[PDB]
DNA sequence: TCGGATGATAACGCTAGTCA
DNA sequence: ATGACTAGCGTTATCATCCG
């Protein structure tokens, strides 16, 4: 039913996105191959295994969705074959002779996204297309495939934002470009701070570093890198690395992830820029997003009202909506537009008026007619309130109220955060993540009464009592800033300190709070003798607006920590 | 690194038995 | 007097960094 397509997350080898694409053209080799020797062959299961082979010998291929993919299991060695594509393509190292369903899943996403493969709704089924069946018969090399692929990128508007993103001919890294991809700030679009990405690179040493490069990445910079490397294969893009001289002085990082744009490339940006229809799906509109349902289709109408009409005021968009079921704000609205403007449509702004200057071909929103009867949630709608609010503080930072909510960022949130506290709080400081550094050091270098204060940054799902394990790890490093013995601790992470800071105190930056948080609290503060607070992420914001507007200093701050909840 | 690979998680949805 | 519904709990869709 719910889908999403459009974005294509491990896939990389054009090579197999063919393959792929023939096991749908009945009359090549593959087709034959995969059925006749892959499928019998690796498909344990005897029942499944005949079936298959099976739906591969009908006069008009059809195939499922669950036909294609199948499904895995959470021991990923110790699964079996259970469909089409898996059995199709092969292993890193052929460790079994198959890909997993998530790959998979990857390669069907992939064919859809680039027109090869169509998806019928009704069926939860996919056929190949004339270019796919075109794409097949192509011989291998030719200059009528890069034809057909190129043809293929142009309508994809991802790779067209990739493109555009470096008509200026600069070198961007890929977090450079994830920063403006897709519906940025958002469940499945969230970006890595290459700021302080850089600085750990640059003082951490070399035992980590790797581990540290092939690691670090959030999922949209996951998309551009890969979207650079299929835009590089074709010739429209050239990858390099870029090295960047971050003084630890004249020290030299990089990020080997990063791209020019080619000839061969603007010439491609100029052709589709008006100077090919793009194909936009209403699953591509959202990908992790919980609220996928509302948001994918209020984007989806917003996309309609822009197409059919032309140079509207934000007014006019607006009414619309409250028309065809969604009675917005201006906020939203313009926000969706960005979203929209980001995955690579073009949309024109003067002033207050808004006018789409490309050619999209028409597509379907699922359930419609019922649209009005969807429902916006209680966390799209704080998301509002708060987009209300934030005049000063960037909307991309509305990002944490989801990102704390998530028990899988508990990395990432770490570095969101002080990155707030630094560029808009504006206290110095550094993230320092680990098992013998705090989350976070901050300090101030202006007030009357510059102080210090121990970060420790946790995500978690719906709520949060400060745990007596995680209280007490604080103390320890409370304690170490004060004896600060290099033979506790010899990283002298309190280092990070000006060496004049005596105020310290400690705090601790989650979701939301409950029942323990003062407890062990007090706790702390008698022992140590330095008081701290615990503070949620929507405070944090309205706070950062108010140290922005005028209304808040960074002192009256420093006199909240109150052994209790801070609250602006 | 390249091109995926991994264990996790929340929404889904199937069963079996309640609710109206 | 039986279809509509759902607590419980195994299944599926989808990550968000990870890694051989």
Redesign the pocket.
Known sequence: ????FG?V?????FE?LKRVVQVFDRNSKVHNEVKNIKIPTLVKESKIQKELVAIMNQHDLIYT??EL?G??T????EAPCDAIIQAT?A???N?KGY?????S??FLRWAHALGFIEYINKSDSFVITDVGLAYSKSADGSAIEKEILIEAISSYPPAIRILTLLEDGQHLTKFDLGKNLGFSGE????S?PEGILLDTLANAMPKDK??I???????S??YA?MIG?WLDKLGLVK?GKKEFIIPTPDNKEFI??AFKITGEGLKVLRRAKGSVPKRVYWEMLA??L?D??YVRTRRALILEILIKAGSLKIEQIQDNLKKLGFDEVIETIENDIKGLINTGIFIEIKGRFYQLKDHILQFVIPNRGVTKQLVKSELEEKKSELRHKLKYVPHEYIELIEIAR????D??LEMKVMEFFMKVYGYRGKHLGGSRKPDGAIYTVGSPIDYGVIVDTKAY?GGYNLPIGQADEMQRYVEENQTRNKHINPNEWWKVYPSSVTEFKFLFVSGHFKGNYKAQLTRLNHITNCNGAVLSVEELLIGGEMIKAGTLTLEEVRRKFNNGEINF
């Open positions: 039913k719910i889908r999403t974005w997350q491990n896939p990389g080898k197999n969705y669950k993919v499904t895995g959470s021991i990923r060695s393509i292993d890193q190292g460790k890909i997993d369903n998530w790959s899943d990857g469940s499945g679009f969230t890595l790797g581990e490069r092939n690691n670090w990445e959030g999922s910079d996951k890198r490397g990858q080997s992830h990908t992790n919980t996928k349902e998530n028990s899988t960022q990395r990432i799902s």
